[PDB]
Amino acid sequence: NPRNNLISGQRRCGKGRNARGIITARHRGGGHKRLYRKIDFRRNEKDIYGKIVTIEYDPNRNAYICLIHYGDGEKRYILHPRGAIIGDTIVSGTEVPIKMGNALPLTDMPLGTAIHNIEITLGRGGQLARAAGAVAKLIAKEGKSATLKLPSGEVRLISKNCSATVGQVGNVGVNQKRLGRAGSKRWLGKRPVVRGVVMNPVDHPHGGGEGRAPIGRKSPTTPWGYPALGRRSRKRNKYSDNFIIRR
Amino acid sequence: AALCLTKRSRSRKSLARTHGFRLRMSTTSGRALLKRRRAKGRKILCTKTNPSSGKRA
Amino acid sequence: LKYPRRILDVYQILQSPIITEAAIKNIADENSLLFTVDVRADKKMIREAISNFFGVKVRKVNTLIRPDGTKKAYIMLNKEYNASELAKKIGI
RNA sequence: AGUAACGCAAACAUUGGUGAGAAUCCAAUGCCCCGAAAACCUAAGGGUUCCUCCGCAAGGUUCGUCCACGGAGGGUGAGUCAGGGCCUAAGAUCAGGCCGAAAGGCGUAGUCGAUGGACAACAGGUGAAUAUUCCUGUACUACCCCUUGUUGGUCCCGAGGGACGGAGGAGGCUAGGUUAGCCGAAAGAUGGUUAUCGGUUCAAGGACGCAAGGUGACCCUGUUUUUCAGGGUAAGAAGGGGUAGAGAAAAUGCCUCGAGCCAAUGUUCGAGUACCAGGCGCUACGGCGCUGAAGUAACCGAUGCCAUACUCCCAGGAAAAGCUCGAACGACCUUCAACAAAAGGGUACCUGUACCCGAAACCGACACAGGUAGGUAGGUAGAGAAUACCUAGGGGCGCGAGACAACUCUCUCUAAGGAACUCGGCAAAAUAGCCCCGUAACUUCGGGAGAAGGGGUGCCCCCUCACAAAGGGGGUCGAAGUGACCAGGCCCGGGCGACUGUUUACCAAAAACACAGGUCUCCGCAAAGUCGUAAGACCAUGUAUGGGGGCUGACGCCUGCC
RNA sequence: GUGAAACUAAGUGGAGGUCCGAACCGACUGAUGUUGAAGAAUCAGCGGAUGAGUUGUGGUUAGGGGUGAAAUGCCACUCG
RNA sequence: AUCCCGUGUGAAUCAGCAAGGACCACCUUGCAAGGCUAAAUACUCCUGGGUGACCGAUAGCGAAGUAGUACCGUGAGGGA
RNA sequence: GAGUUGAAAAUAAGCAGAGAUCCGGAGAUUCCCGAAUAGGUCAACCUUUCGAACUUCUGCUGAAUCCAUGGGCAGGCAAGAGACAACCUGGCGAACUGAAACAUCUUAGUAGCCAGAGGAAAAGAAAGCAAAAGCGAUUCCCGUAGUAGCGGCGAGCGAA
């Protein structure tokens, strides 16, 4: 059933790239209208069951989304995990048992479990590990934190009272869906990127002269002068919540 | 193809949204332009159109 | 209160008739007659200023602007009143 | 220097007329051109160039009696057409709020903002200049009055809906076209002939209704499941209807009734005492006046409707108001006040309306061999909107006349040879349509490929006939049969780039850029990175299968040492 | 064809950054034209032509900048 | 040194504090950390008088008539 | 005090020796746009509940919050907005140039831009100069004086 009156309509126009109008997120423009899907990240209805009726293709995501009803009269969309049998029932809550598809706070669960949709603090919608196959595991918990290995090879002790939708998120087969039509990159609203050697010295620092120019500078740099290999772009004192980068 | 000719058959509504009296009076700069037009003595300080009628001639 | 669209000095809402030969064609052929009115006028203000100063039920009021600035009004009266017997009284 | 030129090589010629004066203005007759226009209408722009009369000082690359020129006068008529009085997109302005030497920057409500959504008129006539606008016919919208009921009603709020993609081909039909029937006329000095020439038109809307079209759920039987023949189900359609939960509507869950439904098309009214061929009477010979026949059928067939109908695909396809339904809460007014209808009358808001609009009037300084969104798409031959010639309609390109030198340019042919020319087959010449046979190296097994190469082709007979295309056999002409226009030249090697694309508007289209793919590296969301003193914005209403940035460039083998 | 697979005739279907070719978009070669008809065109062919398309209308980024499938290209016949 | 600000520290009331060109002692001078005031003074889009070894239509105001006009540019603006 | 209805003639009608035309003082009107102001606007237009919109003042009612604040309603000849050639003040604030280059410096706190305000503005009534002698707010002119100085002790800058 399309036109759910949950597709939410008005957006900012397409894959935009304008802050004041200047190109500030490069190589954007083109494609369809790509009307977004307002899905239910933060499940505000706990301890009421809900079935799964439709796996709809969200063009905003890499994965799919699904339409879930309730015993009461509502309709939401959530990220369906791998193993979403059609007609299967999901239910958020604090003491709900672990099933591939439902949500629960990060305390009342064991350790060593596949979870996609976790929260980094209370009250937010949903932040981490919600791509098309992004799976986060749990190392053991602590007094008010929880060491969580999220899908970067990166561990992070986190606030333990955060909602989390247990399951491995589906549509993994976009690892191998080839874009071999070679203009299908432009259908996603992604213009072609030019390369730094073949620009001019007014544009990029590697604006060369005769021939295929070697990179010339002591380090390969960005078009704004910063070295683009190894230089960690991270503020030295923000949180200190991560245990080891492990990367 | 076309020629290297610049002005064309654009509607005077859109020429009056850019060069008309409203966007000329919506800035300090444009009203300073009207200080220079009224200070010089031009009979037509803007190039505009009318939402109702065309021309009384 | 019943406001008009604009308060426009109702004893000057009509200016002059038109004495061309096509106006006499509209009299003998249309039961209509030709007036010159100012731009700030209506199909509601002219139409009221004919049924009062003349004493005639007016059928329709077809107005047009003229590019020298002033407005032209073809007023068509009712079938009950000949425009020829009411135009010779004015001087057409 | 009285020199080049007079703005395509569609082409004019004559007889009359006007005048002082005519290649040029007008009229007639032929001739010729466009005809997916060089035709008609509208968006933009222009602004009076539109029309009558007068004039020829300047303009018209000549003349001029003419004019888009000069002067005087006139002309643009809307409840229904297009915008505003309705709504929102991109975007703009942003009350408060944050920020900032000033100016102002960010940003919410709100308000503007059509290229979109909503909303009611068509046919004939008139007319020096106006026609969905003026007249006449039939309509339709939005309110008031006149009759029945109701005591609540309007707005805000809750909801449905508005509401949307691309491609594909098959149906059912209309618009147009051809033919036939019917009606009227016709002797068009030629050998014959009526086989010829013109009409055969009608809209919006009001009523009634839809199949051999699509849709209507499952199983068996007969047929190619299919069009249909036949049985059963109690839900299995368009649609209604009850409930249950905090549940008025809605949504969800459960139960029940309905075999039909949908829309172009269609018959009738509108609609004939209209239109129309023709004849009948005067010419200011520019046209008016009276009367008036038939007004049907079939084959094609739309790029238009059904139709946002189905099928497939990913790259997943605006918003708000009008409209419909509805409880509580909140603001106002209340009885002859408010609401809902049924016939019948009354009332009808501003602006645009001329003219040019494939252009002499717009944009190119020009009456400039150029450009300009959209709509209508006739006949024959053809697959066709190419092409060739034409109907409608509109023109003859605003210098002509002699002559027939060199030489330039646009074309045609050329004995004998065939690239010997040349930087280089540059350019020209040649191939060309449909069917049949046949087609190699190599390969990513998709292709190359229409490879290459060869044959038939016009027109009259017959038969087989899917009984429409088409086949075989035969004859007939020409030197030549896709006889005109139109309409692939190909093969063998190599270098580069995988490829389709993009690039220096006005000397470079490439081997350059991009690309799918690969790899390194940064980034855990109060992300990195980018623009901004700042607030903040893009990133992103996305979350490492994601977002930057560097290099290389499909694919196959690999990518060594320091 | 085997108890199911793997795979293949045959139809149906209409995919393509497919092919030929009009409108349309662009400008590869040649000639003309160089006080040109035209401050970039005409003529004869030419490349794409269902897409990484073309175009109208309303907008957006403005010069210690914008934008750039990257040429120092374009930003009102002007752009290190 | 005097005078005024940015960050941070941070006094004394007349037996005092500040200045007298680092600074100290004595003397002299004045009383910051609160405000307001006419005149002499600088100029002409002008106005009213008087002048000019200033101009006389290429001059003098761009402009002696439609003058910031016709015209050019999208516009800022240029300009007879 | 004698003719008038502008330039600007003509024509048609007037107005005037109980005093016109004209001149002067004070008043009245002043459509529409423009601060533009009821709301929108593509200036001289549209829609209109015909409205000085907004800020400020006054008055009532008075949220989360008791007093408050915000808001709403109302009154008001109603204070401000807008314009202004040059001078003046306040803030941002160059560069070509000179130094025979150029960076300190100069040009220059000039031009320009924004804001404000008056016929003038700024400043201004000694926590001041001076030197053992004395003056008595600020501003401007002549002078000291091109002096003392300052300065890649260069170019220059230059008081009291």
From Swiss-Prot, chain A:
Q: State the SUPFAM superfamilies in the record.
A: Nucleic acid-binding proteins (SSF50249), Translation proteins SH3-like domain (SSF50104)
Q: Which residues form a coiled coil?
A: none
Q: Report the GO molecular function annotations.
A: RNA binding; rRNA binding; structural constituent of ribosome; transferase activity
Q: PANTHER family recorded for this chain?
A: LARGE RIBOSOMAL SUBUNIT PROTEIN UL2M, RIBOSOMAL PROTEIN L2
Q: Which NCBIfam families match?
A: rplB_bact
The record's Gene Ontology biological-process terms are: mitochondrial translation
- What is the role of the protein in this entry? Component of the chloroplast ribosome (chloro-ribosome), a dedicated translation machinery responsible for the synthesis of chloroplast genome-encoded proteins, including proteins of the transcription and translation machinery and components of the photosynthetic apparatus.
Primary localization class, coarse: plastid
Q: Which family does it belong to?
A: Belongs to the universal ribosomal protein uL2 family.
| GO CC term, one of those recorded | mitochondrial large ribosomal subunit
InterPro entries annotated for this entry? NA-bd_OB-fold, Rib_uL2_dom2, Ribosomal_uL2, Ribosomal_uL2_bac/org-type, Ribosomal_uL2_C, Ribosomal_uL2_CS, Ribosomal_uL2_dom3, Ribosomal_uL2_RNA-bd_dom
Among Pfam families, the record links this protein to: Ribosomal_L2, Ribosomal_L2_C
Q: Which keywords are on file for this protein? A: Chloroplast, Methylation, Plastid, Ribonucleoprotein, Ribosomal protein
User: What's the source species' lineage?
Assistant: Eukaryota, Viridiplantae, Streptophyta, Embryophyta, Tracheophyta
Q: What is this protein called?
A: Large ribosomal subunit protein uL2cz/uL2cy
Subcellular location(s): the record lists: Plastid, Chloroplast
User: Which portions of the sequence form the region Disordered?
Assistant: 198-247
Q: What do we know about how this protein assembles, alone or with others?
A: Component of the chloroplast large ribosomal subunit (LSU). Mature 70S chloroplast ribosomes of higher plants consist of a small (30S) and a large (50S) subunit. The 30S small subunit contains 1 molecule of ribosomal RNA (16S rRNA) and 24 different proteins. The 50S large subunit contains 3 rRNA molecules (23S, 5S and 4.5S rRNA) and 33 different proteins.
Curated annotation (Swiss-Prot), chain B:
Q: Which superkingdom?
A: Eukaryota
Q: Where in the cell is it found?
A: Plastid, Chloroplast
Segment forming the signal sequence: none
The function of this protein is:
Component of the chloroplast ribosome (chloro-ribosome), a dedicated translation machinery responsible for the synthesis of chloroplast genome-encoded proteins, including proteins of the transcription and translation machinery and components of the photosynthetic apparatus.
Q: How does it assemble?
A: Component of the chloroplast large ribosomal subunit (LSU). Mature 70S chloroplast ribosomes of higher plants consist of a small (30S) and a large (50S) subunit. The 30S small subunit contains 1 molecule of ribosomal RNA (16S rRNA) and 24 different proteins. The 50S large subunit contains 3 rRNA molecules (23S, 5S and 4.5S rRNA) and 33 different proteins.
Q: Which family does it belong to?
A: Belongs to the bacterial ribosomal protein bL34 family.
Write down what this protein is called: Large ribosomal subunit protein bL34c
Q: Which organism is it from?
A: Spinacia oleracea (Spinach)
Instruction: Give the fragment's position in the full-length protein.
Output: 94 to 150 of 152
From Swiss-Prot, chain C:
Localization of this protein: Plastid, Chloroplast
Task: Report the family membership.
Answer: Belongs to the universal ribosomal protein uL23 family.
Q: What does this protein do?
A: Component of the chloroplast ribosome (chloro-ribosome), a dedicated translation machinery responsible for the synthesis of chloroplast genome-encoded proteins, including proteins of the transcription and translation machinery and components of the photosynthetic apparatus.
Q: How does it assemble?
A: Component of the chloroplast large ribosomal subunit (LSU). Mature 70S chloroplast ribosomes of higher plants consist of a small (30S) and a large (50S) subunit. The 30S small subunit contains 1 molecule of ribosomal RNA (16S rRNA) and 24 different proteins. The 50S large subunit contains 3 rRNA molecules (23S, 5S and 4.5S rRNA) and 33 different proteins.
Additional note from the record: Two forms of the protein exist; they have the same N-terminal sequence and approximately the same molecular weight.
- Protein name from the UniProt record: Large ribosomal subunit protein uL23c
What is the species listed in this Swiss-Prot or TrEMBL entry? Spinacia oleracea
